[PDB]
Amino acid sequence: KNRDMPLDSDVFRVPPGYNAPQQVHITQGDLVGRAMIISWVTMDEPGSSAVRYWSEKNGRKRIAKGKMSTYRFFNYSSGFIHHTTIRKLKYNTKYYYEVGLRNTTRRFSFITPPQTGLDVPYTFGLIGDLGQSFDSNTTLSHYELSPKKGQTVLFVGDLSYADRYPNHDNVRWDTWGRFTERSVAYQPWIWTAGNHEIEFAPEINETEPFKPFSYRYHVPYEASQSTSPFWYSIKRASAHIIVLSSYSAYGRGTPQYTWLKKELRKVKRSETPWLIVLMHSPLYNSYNHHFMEGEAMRTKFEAWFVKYKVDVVFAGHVHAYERSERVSNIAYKITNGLCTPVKDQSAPVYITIGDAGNYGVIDSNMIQPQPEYSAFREASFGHGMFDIKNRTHAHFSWNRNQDGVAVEADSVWFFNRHWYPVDDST
Amino acid sequence: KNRDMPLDSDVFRVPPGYNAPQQVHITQGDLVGRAMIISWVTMDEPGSSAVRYWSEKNGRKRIAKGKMSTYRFFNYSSGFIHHTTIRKLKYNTKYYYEVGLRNTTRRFSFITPPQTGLDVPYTFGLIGDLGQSFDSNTTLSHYELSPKKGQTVLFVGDLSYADRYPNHDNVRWDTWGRFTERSVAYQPWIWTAGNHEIEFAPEINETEPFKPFSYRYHVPYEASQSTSPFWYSIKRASAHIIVLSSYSAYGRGTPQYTWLKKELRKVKRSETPWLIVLMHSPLYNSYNHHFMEGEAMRTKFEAWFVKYKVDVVFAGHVHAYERSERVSNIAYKITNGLCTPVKDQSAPVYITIGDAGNYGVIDSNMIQPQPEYSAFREASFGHGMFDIKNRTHAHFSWNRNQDGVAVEADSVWFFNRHWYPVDDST
Ligand SMILES: *[C@@H]1O[C@H](CO)[C@@H](O[C@@H]2O[C@H](CO)[C@@H](O)[C@H](O)[C@H]2NC(C)=O)[C@H](O[C@@H]2O[C@@H](C)[C@@H](O)[C@@H](O)[C@@H]2O)[C@H]1NC(C)=O
Ligand SMILES: *[C@@H]1O[C@H](CO)[C@@H](O[C@@H]2O[C@H](CO)[C@@H](O)[C@H](O)[C@H]2NC(C)=O)[C@H](O[C@@H]2O[C@@H](C)[C@@H](O)[C@@H](O)[C@@H]2O)[C@H]1NC(C)=O
Ligand SMILES: *[C@@H]1O[C@H](CO)[C@@H](O[C@@H]2O[C@H](CO)[C@@H](O)[C@H](O)[C@H]2NC(C)=O)[C@H](O[C@@H]2O[C@@H](C)[C@@H](O)[C@@H](O)[C@@H]2O)[C@H]1NC(C)=O
Ligand SMILES: *[C@@H]1O[C@H](CO)[C@@H](O[C@@H]2O[C@H](CO)[C@@H](O)[C@H](O)[C@H]2NC(C)=O)[C@H](O[C@@H]2O[C@@H](C)[C@@H](O)[C@@H](O)[C@@H]2O)[C@H]1NC(C)=O
Ligand SMILES: *[C@@H]1O[C@H](CO)[C@@H](O[C@@H]2O[C@H](CO)[C@@H](O)[C@H](O)[C@H]2NC(C)=O)[C@H](O[C@@H]2O[C@@H](C)[C@@H](O)[C@@H](O)[C@@H]2O)[C@H]1NC(C)=O
Ligand SMILES: *[C@@H]1O[C@H](CO)[C@@H](O)[C@H](O)[C@H]1NC(C)=O
Ligand SMILES: *[C@@H]1O[C@H](CO)[C@@H](O)[C@H](O)[C@H]1NC(C)=O
Ligand SMILES: *[C@@H]1O[C@H](CO)[C@@H](O)[C@H](O)[C@H]1NC(C)=O
Ligand SMILES: CC1(C)Cc2cccc(CO)c2O1
Ligand SMILES: CC1(C)Cc2cccc(CO)c2O1
Ligand SMILES: [Fe+3]
Ligand SMILES: [Fe+3]
Ligand SMILES: [Zn+2]
Ligand SMILES: [Zn+2]
């Protein structure tokens, strides 16, 4: 069918005034929380890439300077894209920032996270495969109305679904920018790259993977000694978050592979006890759709995730909700017969959470019966929250769109794999 | 325990004359064999990129123009690299070609293949992980001294092993170019990217993978609508050869995955009976060294190879020889326990032929006992020959450096999977 919100929808409205900055969004700008990448688009002319900013406390108004860029895609011309990095911020404080300093100015605000620490509580939103359908709008609306009150969104891939349109009509990137602004202009969303961001379209001489995405959404990849925007890590509060790319190389000797192997070695559980991995394609998935796609990355990375006692791996891709048991399937040796996943308290829980809305379609077909390794699964739209209480406890909840904003359809306690490695099995 | 040929070795002699072209190599330059890429380096000055060439049939001298490029790697500065494509060649005819038209000219010849066809015989050589050890030299001589007479080399990756040197001393790329000249200047070598081509070294601000390889060795990739030099196909005689990149992305939706999926659809067994796939890392391997590394790509591609009746898949990486049975391992679904390879007449034979010499170390450790899927494996240096008699028969043989050039240690008839799918089991 067609359940994408019409161009003239209220979520798509353009901020008024000559060259008013639009599609504003922010994300963590450094490795630990002291910086922030502020981004936006101006449509009438290049404009300034300057950000004004100040804490509500100490009232000194500083000015950050950034860069402007443009891109083309087939018959589409981007507007003027700005990214600026505000650095040396104070932990745990509200900051006001402004963009569009030369003409129409707009003001926004954000709150830096506490300094990383073993016992720092923090609430992450979890959203995958958002799209811009009516379902999409409902999810975002639930998240912002959650009483748990999310401070950062971990976003597991597939943003605008703009590549489903005629010529990947990139206007549909612009709309998704203006739609998400009401959330991401005030809190970082941590970006993962999904298959709808590949935009590989040889048929119209666009053969550079990830182009529109890579122009519109910067991440702090050098911060973690990565050579690419598609894999990086950041530390925020008590969490160490590794972000991977289901669609870049991960063979032995590749950049991503090499970077990951080192990065894990840099994880200090006494400083960030919550080790979280993000990636678009799930490695454990009992839905028919995309079943076993994640098998290739699993052969390369699963054993590591276990060696390093990862707490949780979030994925999207599959348009539905799943939560694995703590299992591993890493004893296989071709001829040894050992290919069944087994209970394993060192392994992460795997969560598919790619049901935020996409283009309005849910994946309902499941392998039957439910496999031993699947703890819970349901084909409903929604988003999740991973809520860190302390060094031993994180409460994860899944909320459905058909339910009330306070209802938790599925809800489990995560016991830390380093500080409290006990059967949290449901 | 350093077995590389010294810099003052004869095989590394510099051709004489001011700005004499060196490191001359050719490779197919179009899809079906009517074009040829001539490559060389000049050291003294840029020089001309023109190539003079005539056929023996017509004795009409013609000029083709190409491009010159250069690169740097850390503190290394390349010479002047030339790539020129000759086009509109006539099938099955002898050409002479000349390079270095301004100062020192040098003359070489090649022979276009026959026009592609169902019953067109052709002898392909197989070489992998060649290197520049004394072992490397022996393999190359056995190859050129072969009664079988290879007409084209299918080269499964790992060229110079320059990257084993301090800062990857790219000088050892130059020496390798000069050393292989006595073969590749007179017959094409088809190039596969190996792990020693990756040359990802962020420690010295060299982070563009395949850089040196990319500049020195061009391939006719746009010819098969690939968008990258690391995966592509050519048609030569009665074979359709597909080259893949073990160290590029092959995830679902990525360029290589997309290209391969479409390319297999394009194969016409009625034009090119013998379907051959080259990659660096083996899908089946029963040796310790690199055991199971090919698992990831296998999970993505194996079923396609079975589905399209691939006749043979060649690889290297493992420094030995191995030949599998026709097997598949494509029934696994995580929980059905079906993870054992089975005889499968519809599947390719998998050959590991990465034993041309490298830097002089053979991989002798094998997993015992020999798996059912493994038909033959020996830890000796040498090369292979894939000799196509016609649409039904091809004869594969393996020559050992320790044997006479005319002796075959392993020998086996392939019965075409599309035209003559009789059990060709040994
Ligand atoms: C967008 O911001 C610009 C910078 O503030 C405005 O222009 C500047 O206005 C100053 C005082 O009006 C004047 O000294 C400058 O010449 C002028 N422009 C530049 C290039 O700095 C601009 O205002 C409009 O454009 C300028 C050239 C004038 O003609 C005004 O009359 C226009 O309103 C702002 N643009 C708009 C459309 O608001
Ligand atoms: C980390 O946070 C957990 C959730 O807030 C704490 O658990 C809870 O402790 C309450 C009293 O503090 C108790 O009434 C609740 O039943 C319990 N909730 C759960 C899900 O267990 C936890 O507190 C510690 O660990 C628990 C299991 C008890 O032994 C408490 O006495 C401990 O203080 C917090 N752990 C730490 C290290 O602070
Ligand atoms: C590129 O850098 C290398 C070191 O990072 C140069 O080699 C080093 O030179 C040192 C003093 O010049 C010498 O004592 C070291 O043994 C050596 N380091 C290594 C690991 O080889 C290299 O140099 C040239 O060749 C070397 C062997 C010497 O003959 C030097 O005199 C030469 O400059 C550098 N290459 C270039 C093109 O600059
Ligand atoms: C490389 O070839 C060039 C011609 O293709 C030479 O330049 C030429 O040398 C001829 C000497 O026999 C001279 O008459 C021509 O004028 C000249 N053609 C040009 C300049 O394009 C070149 O010779 C060297 O450089 C020239 C400019 C003079 O300086 C000569 O004395 C040099 O030999 C050849 N290079 C070398 C180093 O042999
Ligand atoms: C295609 O090439 C095959 C390999 O050369 C041919 O088989 C060979 O045929 C020879 C006589 O032509 C015979 O003496 C060889 O022993 C035989 N070699 C093998 C390995 O079988 C094949 O020839 C056809 O089929 C064979 C089996 C014979 O029965 C002949 O009658 C046929 O020529 C070639 N196919 C064709 C159709 O030519
Ligand atoms: C691009 O092409 C489509 C038809 O292919 C057309 O309808 C659309 O208006 C064009 N967009 C622009 C901005 O040129
Ligand atoms: C999206 O949700 C917002 C907030 O709940 C609402 O005000 C708006 O009308 C919705 N937009 C559409 C097109 O559904
Ligand atoms: C390499 O082999 C060739 C041919 O066998 C021979 O002419 C030459 O002596 C050898 N050179 C070295 C360095 O082994
Ligand atoms: C099957 C593909 C090409 C992959 C994929 C992942 C997530 C969502 C969609 C729907 O187009 C999708 O289409
Ligand atoms: C273990 C590694 C670094 C991998 C690899 C691939 C191909 C050749 C070699 C050399 O031993 C090699 O050593
Ligand atoms: Fe999706
Ligand atoms: Fe090798
Ligand atoms: Zn997806
Ligand atoms: Zn290798």
CA-nearest of A245, A227, A211 to B198 is: A227
How far is B356 from B249, CA to CA, in rounded Å?
27
Cβ atoms within 10 Å of B141's Cβ, excluding its own: 14
Please choose, from the candidates B262, B258, B228, B261, the residue with its C-alpha nearest in 3D space to the C-alpha of residue B245. Answer: B228
Confirm or reject: Cβ of B200 under 6 Å from ligand 8: no
- Going by the annotation, the residues of the binding site of B for Fe cation are 129, 158, 161, 319
Dist CA A262 CA A107 (whole Å): 40
Is A383 annotated as catalytic? no
Query: Ligand 2 within 6 A of A411 CB?
Result: no
- CA B218 – CA A114 distance, rounded (Å): 52
B249–A247 CB contact, under 8 Å: yes
Nearest by CB to residue A202, choosing from B225, B249, B292, is B225
Cβ B162 vs Cβ B360: under 8 Å = no
Q: For residue A156, what is the DSSP state?
A: -
Taking CA atoms only, the protein residue closest to ligand 5 atom 8 is B393
Q: Is A210 left (phi over 0), alpha (psi -120 to 50) or beta?
A: left
Among A122, A123, A148, A393, say which to mutate for ligand 2: greatest number of ligand atoms within 8 Å of CB.
A393
Name residues contacting ligand 5 (CB within 6 A): B 389-390, 392-393, 413
SS3 A187: coil
Cα B229 to ligand 7 centroid, rounded to whole Å: 47
Torsion of CA A21, A25, A30, A32, to 10 degrees: 140
CA-nearest residue, atom 36 of ligand 5:
B390
Backbone angles phi, psi at B256, to 5 degrees: -65, -50
Q: Which residues contact A363 (CB under 8 A, 6 or more apart)?
A: A287, A288, A289, A318, A319, A320, A379
Q: Within 13 Å and on the Cβ side, how many CA atoms surround A372? A: 12
Ligand nearest to the CA of A182: 7
Q: CA geometry: angle at B288 spanning B346 and B353, to 5°?
A: 55
List, in order, residues 6 or more apart from B203 with CB less than 8 Å away: none
Residue in A198, A207, A300 nearest the CB of B296: A300
Closest-CA distance of chain B to residue A380, Å: 24
A10 Cβ inside 6 Å of ligand 7? yes
Tell which CATH architecture fits domain A117-426.
4-Layer Sandwich (3.60)
Residue A34 has φ and ψ, to the nearest 5°, of: -85, -5
Residue in the block written with tokens 């900051």: A95
Number of the ligand 6 atom closest to the C-alpha atom of A75 = 14
How close is the nearest chain A Cα to the Cα of B160, in Å? 17
- Asked if B250 lies within 8 A of A296 by C-beta distance, the reply is yes
Q: Is A300 in the pocket of ligand 2 (CB under 6 A)?
A: no
CB A130 within 8 A of CB A159: yes
Contacts of residue B227 in chain A, CB cutoff 8 Å? Answer: 202, 207
Resolution in A: 2.7
Question: Rounded to the nearest 5°, which phi and psi values hold at A86?
Answer: -85, 120
DSSP string, B115-154: PP-TT--EEEEEE-S--SBHHHHHHHHHHHT-TT--SEEE
CB–CB contacts below 8 A, A to B: 111
Which residues of B are less than 8 Å from A247 in CB distance?
A: 249, 251-254
Torsions phi, psi for A321 (to 5 deg): -125, 125
Q: Which residues of B are annotated as a binding site for Zn(2+)?
A: 158, 195, 280, 317
Distance between first and last Cα of chain A: 37
The Cα B262–Cα B174 span in angstroms is 37
| Residue A16 token pair | 């008024």
> How far apart are alpha carbons A185 and A199 in whole angstroms?
25
Cβ of A8 closer than 6 Å to ligand 7, yes or no, is: no
Structure tokens at B373: 């899927």
Q: How many CB atoms lie within 10 A of CB B103?
A: 15
Q: Find out whether B316 and B354 touch, Cβ atoms under 8 Å.
A: yes
B210 close to B193: Cβ distance less than 8 angstroms: yes
Chain B residues with CB under 8 Å of A209 CB are 249, 254-255
Q: Determine the Cα–Cα distance for residues B367 and B302; give it in Å rounded to an integer.
A: 22
Distance CA(B3)–CA(B132), nearest Å, equals 8
* B20-116 shares its CATH topology with B117-426: no
To the question of whether residue A44 is assigned a binding role by annotation, the answer is: no
Which one is catalytic: A142, A196, A290, A383?
A290
Q: Which two tokens stand for residue A221?
A: 């990849």
* B195/chain A closest Cα distance in angstroms: 7
Distance, C-alpha B52 to centroid of its chain: 26
| CA atoms of B242 and B255, how far apart (whole Å) | 15
Report the CATH number of the A20-116 domain.
Answer: 2.60.40.380
The answer to the question of whether A393 is labelled as a binding residue is no
Using CA atoms, how far apart are residues A408 and A304, in angstroms rounded to an integer? 32
Cα–chain center distance at B324: 20
- Alpha carbons within 13 angstroms on the beta-carbon side of residue A59 total 0
Residue A316 Cα to ligand 11 middle (Å): 7
Q: Where do the structural domains in chain B lie, given as residue ranges? A: 20-116, 117-426
DSSP A14: P
A368 phi and psi angles, rounded to 5 deg: -120, 145
Q: Write out chain A residues lying below 8 Å of B333, CB-based.
A: 292, 367
Please judge whether B334 and A247 are an interchain contact, meaning their C-beta atoms are less than 8 angstroms apart: no
Residue A77: CB within 6 Å of ligand 6? no
For residue B281, the distance in angstroms to the closest alpha carbon of chain A comes to 10
For residue B303, the 8-state DSSP code is H
Does residue A18 have its Cβ closer than 6 Å to ligand 1?
yes
Ligand 2 pocket member A141 (CB < 6 A): no
> Choosing among A254, A297, A317, which should be mutated to test the B contact, i.e. which has the most B CBs within 10 A?
A254
Residues in A touching B209 (Cβ below 8 Å): 254-255
**B→A interface, C-beta within 8 Å:** 195, 198, 200, 202, 207, 209, 225, 227, 246-255, 258, 281, 292-293, 295-297, 299-300, 329, 332-335, 337-341, 371-373
Give, as one character, the DSSP assignment of residue B5. Answer: P
Chain B residue with CA closest to A284: the answer is B334
**Under an 8 A CB cutoff, do B198 and A341 touch?**
no
- Structural element, H or E, at residue B395: strand B393-400
Which of B178, B212, B207 minimizes the C-alpha distance to B194? Answer: B212
- Computed from CA positions of residues B379, B380, B381, B384, in that sequence, does the dihedral angle turn out positive or negative? negative
- Residues of chain A contacting residue B200, judged by C-beta atoms under 8 Å apart: 253-255, 258
Residue list, ligand 4 pocket, CB within 6 Å? B 18, 102-103
* CA atoms of A38 and A54, how far apart (whole Å): 14
- Return the closest-CA partner of residue A269 out of A240, A243, A296, A292: A240
**What distance separates the 2 farthest-apart alpha carbons in chain B?**
69
Question: Which of B122, B94, B172 shows the shortest CA–CA distance to B394?
Answer: B122
Residue of B207, B297, B337 lying closest to A227 (CB–CB): B207
Q: Measured between alpha carbons, how far is A5 from A134 in angstroms, rounded to an integer?
A: 6
User: How far is residue A213's CA from residue A216's CA, in Å, rounded to a whole number?
Assistant: 5
| CA A391 to ligand 13 centroid distance, Å | 32
Nearest CA in chain B to A226: B202
Q: Is A82 annotated as a binding residue?
A: no
